[PDB]
Amino acid sequence: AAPKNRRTIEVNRCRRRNPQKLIKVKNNIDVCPECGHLKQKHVLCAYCYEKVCKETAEIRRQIGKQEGGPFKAPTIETVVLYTGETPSEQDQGKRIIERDRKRPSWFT
Amino acid sequence: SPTELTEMRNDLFNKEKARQLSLTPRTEKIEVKHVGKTDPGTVFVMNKNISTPYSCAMHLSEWYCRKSILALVDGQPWDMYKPLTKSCEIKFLTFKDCDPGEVNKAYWRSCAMMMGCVIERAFKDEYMVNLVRAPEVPVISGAFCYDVVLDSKLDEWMPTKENLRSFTKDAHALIYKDLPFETLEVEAKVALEIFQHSKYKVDFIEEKASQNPERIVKLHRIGDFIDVSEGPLIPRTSICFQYEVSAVHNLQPTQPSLIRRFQGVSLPVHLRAHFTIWDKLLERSRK
Amino acid sequence: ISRKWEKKNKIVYPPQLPGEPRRPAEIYHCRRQIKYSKDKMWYLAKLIRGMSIDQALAQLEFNDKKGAKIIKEVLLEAQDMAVRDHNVEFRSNLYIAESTSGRGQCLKRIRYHGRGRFGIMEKVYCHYFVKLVEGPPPPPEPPKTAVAHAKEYIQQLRSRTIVHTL
Amino acid sequence: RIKDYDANFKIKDFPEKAKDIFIEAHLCLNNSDHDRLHTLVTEHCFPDMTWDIKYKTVRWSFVESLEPSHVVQVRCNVYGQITVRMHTRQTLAIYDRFGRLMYGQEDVPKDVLEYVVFEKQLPYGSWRMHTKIVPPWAPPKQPILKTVMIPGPQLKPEEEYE
Amino acid sequence: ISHGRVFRRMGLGPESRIHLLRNLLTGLVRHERIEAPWARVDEMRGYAEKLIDYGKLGDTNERAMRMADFWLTEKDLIPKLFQVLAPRYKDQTGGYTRMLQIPNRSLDRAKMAVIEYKGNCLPPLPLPRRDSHLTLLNQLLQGLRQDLRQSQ
Ligand SMILES: [Mg+2]
Ligand SMILES: [Mg+2]
Ligand SMILES: [Zn+2]
Numbered sequence: 001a002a003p004k005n006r007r008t009i010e011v012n013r014c015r016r017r018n019p020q021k022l023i024k025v026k027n028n029i030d031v032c033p034e035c036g037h038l039k040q041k042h043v044l045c046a047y048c049y050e051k052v053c054k055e056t057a058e059i060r061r062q063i064g065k066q067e068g069g070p071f072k073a074p075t076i077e078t079v080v081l082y083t084g085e086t087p088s089e090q091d092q093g094k095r096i097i098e099r100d101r102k103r104p105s106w107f108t
Numbered sequence: 109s110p111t112e113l114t115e116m117r118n119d120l121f122n123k124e125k126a127r128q129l130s131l132t133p134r135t136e137k138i139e140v141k142h143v144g145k146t147d148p149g150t151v152f153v154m155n156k157n158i159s160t161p162y163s164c165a166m167h168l169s170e171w172y173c174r175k176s177i178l179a180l181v182d183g184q185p186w187d188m189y190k191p192l193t194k195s196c197e198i199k200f201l202t203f204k205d206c207d208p209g210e211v212n213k214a215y216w217r218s219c220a221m222m223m224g225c226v227i228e229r230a231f232k233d234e235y236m237v238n239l240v241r242a243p244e245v246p247v248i249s250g251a252f253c254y255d256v257v258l259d260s261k262l263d264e265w266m267p268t269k270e271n272l273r274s275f276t277k278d279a280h281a282l283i284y285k286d287l288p289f290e291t292l293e294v295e296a297k298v299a300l301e302i303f304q305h306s307k308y309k310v311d312f313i314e315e316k317a318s319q320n321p322e323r324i325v326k327l328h329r330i331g332d333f334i335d336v337s338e339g340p341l342i343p344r345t346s347i348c349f350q351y352e353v354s355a356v357h358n359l360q361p362t363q364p365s366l367i368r369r370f371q372g373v374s375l376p377v378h379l380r381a382h383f384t385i386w387d388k389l390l391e392r393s394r395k
Numbered sequence: 396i397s398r399k400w401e402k403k404n405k406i407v408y409p410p411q412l413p414g415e416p417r418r419p420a421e422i423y424h425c426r427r428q429i430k431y432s433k434d435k436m437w438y439l440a441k442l443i444r445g446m447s448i449d450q451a452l453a454q455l456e457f458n459d460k461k462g463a464k465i466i467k468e469v470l471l472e473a474q475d476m477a478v479r480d481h482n483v484e485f486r487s488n489l490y491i492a493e494s495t496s497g498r499g500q501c502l503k504r505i506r507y508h509g510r511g512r513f514g515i516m517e518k519v520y521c522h523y524f525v526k527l528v529e530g531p532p533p534p535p536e537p538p539k540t541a542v543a544h545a546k547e548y549i550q551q552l553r554s555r556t557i558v559h560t561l
Numbered sequence: 562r563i564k565d566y567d568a569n570f571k572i573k574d575f576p577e578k579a580k581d582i583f584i585e586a587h588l589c590l591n592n593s594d595h596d597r598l599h600t601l602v603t604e605h606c607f608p609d610m611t612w613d614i615k616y617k618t619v620r621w622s623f624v625e626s627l628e629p630s631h632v633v634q635v636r637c638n639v640y641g642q643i644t645v646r647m648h649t650r651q652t653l654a655i656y657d658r659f660g661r662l663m664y665g666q667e668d669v670p671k672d673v674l675e676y677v678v679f680e681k682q683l684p685y686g687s688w689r690m691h692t693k694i695v696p697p698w699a700p701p702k703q704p705i706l707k708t709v710m711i712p713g714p715q716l717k718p719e720e721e722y723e
Numbered sequence: 724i725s726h727g728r729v730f731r732r733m734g735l736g737p738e739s740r741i742h743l744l745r746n747l748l749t750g751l752v753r754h755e756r757i758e759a760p761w762a763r764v765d766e767m768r769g770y771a772e773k774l775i776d777y778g779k780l781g782d783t784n785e786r787a788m789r790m791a792d793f794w795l796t797e798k799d800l801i802p803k804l805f806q807v808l809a810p811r812y813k814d815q816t817g818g819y820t821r822m823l824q825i826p827n828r829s830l831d832r833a834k835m836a837v838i839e840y841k842g843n844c845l846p847p848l849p850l851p852r853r854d855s856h857l858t859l860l861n862q863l864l865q866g867l868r869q870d871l872r873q874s875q
C-alpha cells in the first residue's frame with residue numbers, strides 16, 4: 001500500500017501538533033531540601049545520589065584493596081572508619097575500611 | 109466615615125514610606141551572604157533599604173521565591189518584603205523546614221490579619237466594628253483567633269452558618285486578590301497618628317513601644333488595611349489556599365464590652381490537606 | 396546561510412526618557428548544527444515557549460529526549476549572557492518569549508536495500524533559537540467565558556445590515 | 562630628551578593641550594568616533610576605553626575644571642610619557658542596549674581627580690592618552706544601580722562546602 | 724491476556740530470566756547495593772528476600788545450601804549469606820531490601836532503581852523522609868490527637 005496523494009502541510013500540522021503528541025508538563029518536580037538541586041518527588045535526587053555513589057566507589061576501592069583478589073568476600077561484617085575515628089566496642093570484630101578523608105556530614 | 113478613615117490611614121502610611129525611603133537617598137550597597145545550607149557562599153550586593161529577601165530569592169532562582177516564606181537576617185525573622193538595612197547573613201525559611209516554627213507563627217499572624225480585614229469590611233455601615241487585638245495563640249490551639257468589639261446594637265446577634273460562609277467568601281476574595289504583605293517599622297508617634305480613632309489599637313501600640321527599646325512598631329498593610337503586627341508576616345495572601353472563618357465566641361467578661369473572638373483555620377498551598385482532614389480541622393477549630 | 400539571530404543582540408535602542416516605561420531586556424541566543432531532527436526539537440521548543448527560565452530548566456532537566464540537554468545548555472548560556480552583558484538584574488526574572496527549531500545544513504548518505512537498490516539518508520542537523528525577555532512570564536490567555544462568548548454573538552447579531560438594498 | 566627630539570615643546574604649555582586631548586577623546590567616546598579616538602588616544606588606551614562601552618550609550622560631558630591642570634612627572638623607537646594631574650568636574654550617564662540608565666546621573670556633576678599619562682612616539686607621532694593611574698587611596702567609585710549576585714563555589718557532588 | 728501473571732518476561736526466555744536475576748542477586752549479595760533497571764530490580768527483590776530466608780534456615784539445611792549454591796554464582800558469598808546477612812536479619816521477619824527509584828539511565832533513558840540490603844556498611848542513601856512533625860499541618864493534626872486523647 002502506497003499513499004494515493006501527498007498529505008498537505010495543514011493535515012500534517014493537525015497531526016503532529018495534536019495535544020497528544022505534545023510533551024506534557026511535569027508537575028512532580030521539586031527542590032531537594034539537602035542540596036537544593038531539582039528532583040522528582042518519587043525519584044532520588046541526582047546530586048545526592050551521585051555523592052553517595054562516589055563515596056561508595058571510594059569505599060569499594062578500599063574494600064577491594066583490603067580483600068586482594070577475587071573470591072575473597074569476608075565472612076564478617078564491615079565498618080567504614082574515617083580519619084580521626086577509632087573502632088567502637090560494637091565495631092570490634094568487624095573488618096575496618098579506612099578512608100583517607102574526614103567523616104562526611106551526611107554519612108553517620 | 110469608614111472610607112475616609114481608610115483613605116487617610118493609607119495616606120499616612122504612604123507618606124511614611126516616602127519619608128523612610130527618602131531618608132536614605134542614592135544607592136548604598138550592603139553585602140548579604142547566604143548562610144543557608146543550599147547554595148552556600150553566594151553574596152548579594154544589594155541596595156540598602158530598597159532590596160528585600162524577595163530580591164535575594166529572585167537573584168537565586170524562582171524556586172526560592174515560591175517556597176521561601178520568611179527570611180532569617182542575622183538570626184532574626186524578617187518578612188520576605190521587608191527592605192534590608194545592612195550587610196548581613198540571610199537564610200530563607202520555608203514551610204517544610206525541620207523546625208518551621210517561625211514560619212508557622214508568621215502564617216498564623218497573617219491569617220489573623222486577613223480575618224481582621226474581612227471582619228472590619230463585612231458588617232453593614234450602621235454597625236460599628238472595632239478590632240481590639242489578635243491574640244498570639246499557638247498553632248496547637250487549632251485556630252487563629254482575632255478579637256473584635258461590635259456595635260452595641262448587635263449585642264445579642266450571633267453569626268449564622270451563612271454569615272460565616274460569607275466571611276469565608278470574603279477571605280477567599282482576598283486570597284484571589286493576592287495582595288502583598290507590606291511592612292514598615294514606624295515610630296509609635298506615627299502609629300498613634302494613624303490609629304488615633306481606635307483606643308484598642310492605641311493601647312496596643314503603647315504596649316509594643318514599651319516592649320521594644322525605642323518606640324518602633326511593626327505596621328502592616330495587605331491592601332487599604334493598616335494593622336499593628338505582633339511579628340513578621342508571610343509574603344502574599346495567595347500563599348493561603350484553604351481558609352475558613354470557623355466560628356465566633358463571645359468572651360465571658362461581657363460587662364465592660366462584648367469581646368467576640370473570631371476563630372478561623374487555614375493551610376497554605378504548600379501544605380494542602382485533603383477534604384476529610386480539612387473537615388476534621390474545621391470541626392476542631394470551631395471550638 | 397543566515398545568521399540574523401546572532402546580530403539581533405547588537406541593536407542599541409536610544410536612551411529612554413525619564414517618563415517612559417522601562418523597556419524589558421531581550422536576549423537572543425541560538426545553537427547551530429545540532430545533530431538532531433528539527434521536528435523532534437520543535438516539541439521541546441513548544442513545550443518551553445512562554446515559561447519562565449527556571450520552569451523551563453526544571454522541565455528540561457527531567458525530559459528524556461536528547462534535545463532537552465542541548466536546550467538546557469542553550470538556556471543556561473542565554474541566562475549567563477543576559478546577566479553579564481544585557482544588564483538583567485535577576486537570573487530568574489526571564490521568560491522564553493520565543494523558542495523555535497530550524498533546519499540545519501544536512502549531509503546526504505546512502506542506505507543499502509535488499510536488491511541492489513538504495514535510499515538517500517539525510518544526516519539531519521537542526522538549529523535552535525531562544526529569545527529571553529526580562530520580567531515575569533505573561534499570564535496564560537484565559538479561556539473565554541460564556542459571558543464573553545455570548546457578548547461576541549450579540550455583537551455579530553448587531554453588526555447585521557440589510558444587504559443588497561438602499 | 563623631549564626637546565632634543567622635537568625642538569618646540571613646552572612643559573608649561575602642555576597641561577592645556579592635555580586637557581583638550583582628554584575632553585576631545587571623551588566626546589569621541591560619547592559619539593562613538595573611533596577614528597578620532599585612534600588619533601586622540603593610544604592603542605593601549607583605545608581598547609580599555611571602548612571594549613566595555615561597546616553596545617551601550619555613554620553621555621559624558623565636562624562641565625568645569627576645579628584646579629588648573631599641571632604636569633607632574635615625565636619620563637622617556639623612543640617614547641615620551643607625561644603624567645598630568647587633573648582635578649576636574651564631569652558627568653556620566655551610561656545606558657544599556659535598551660536605553661535604561663545603569664550608571665551616573667545625566668545632570669549631577671561629580672568631582673574627579675585623575676592622573677592621565679600621555680605618550681608620544683619619536684616622525685608623524687603626536688601626544689595621546691596612554692593610561693590613567695588610579696591612586697590606591699582613590700575614593701570608591703559611584704555605586705551601581707542594579708543589584709548583583711556573586712555565585713559561591715559551585716561544588717561538585719564529591720566536594721563539600723567549607 | 725495476562726490476568727494473574729506475576730512474573731515479568733525477561734531476557735531470552737525463562738532460563739535466561741532466571742540467570743539474569745541470579746547475576747543481579749549475586750551482585751546484590753556481594754556489594755549490598757546494586758543499581759539496575761527498575762523492572763529487573765523489582766523482579767529480583769523477592770528472590771533476595773527468599774535468599775535471606777534460606778540463609779536464616781541455616782548452614783546445616785541441605786535444601787538451603789543447595790538454594791544458595793544455585794543462586795550465588797560466586798561461591799565465596801555463600802559463607803557470607805549464611806554468616807553475615809542472615810545473622811544481621813535474625814531479628815527481622817521481612818523487608819530486608821530497600822528499593823528506590825533513581826534518575827533514568829543516561830544511555831537509554833531506562834527506568835532505574837537502586838536495591839540494597841538494609842544495615843549495610845555503605846553510606847546511607849538519600850532516602851525520602853516524611854515532613855517534620857513541626858510543620859503547620861502536622862501541628863494541627865497533633866492538636867487534633869491531643870484533643871481526642873483528652874476527650875478519652
Ligand atoms: Mg528523506
Ligand atoms: Mg525482551
Ligand atoms: Zn539533593
